[PDB]
């Protein structure tokens, strides 16, 4: 962090990439979370199958 930070800040770059990964994980959780996910939340009356 001290030595290799011009023209780019190393800590900020690492934080940005990690936050991107975290946001992708959040998108995954919104769908596949076992207790609050959409797929778990749908009801049997609202579930249908292809013909």
């Amino acid at each position: 962090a001290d030595l290799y930070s011009s023209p780019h800040d190393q800590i900020k770059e690492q934080l940005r990439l990690t936050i991107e990964t975290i946001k992708e994980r959040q998108e995954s959780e919104l769908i596949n979370n076992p207790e609050y996910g959409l797929l778990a939340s749908v009801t049997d009356d609202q579930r249908i199958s292809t013909l």
Binding site: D2, L3, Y4, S5, S6
Partner: protein, 44 residues
Amino acid sequence: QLALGDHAARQLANATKTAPQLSTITPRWLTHLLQWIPVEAGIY
């Protein structure tokens, strides 16, 4: 004893205390003589 002694009298007195002295300190002439150049990102 005619009067109060120096050993007893010092208990009311504040000593002058120096910062600790370090024997290994040297003038370090070479650092003063050299010319120092800044590097942008640790590479030269």
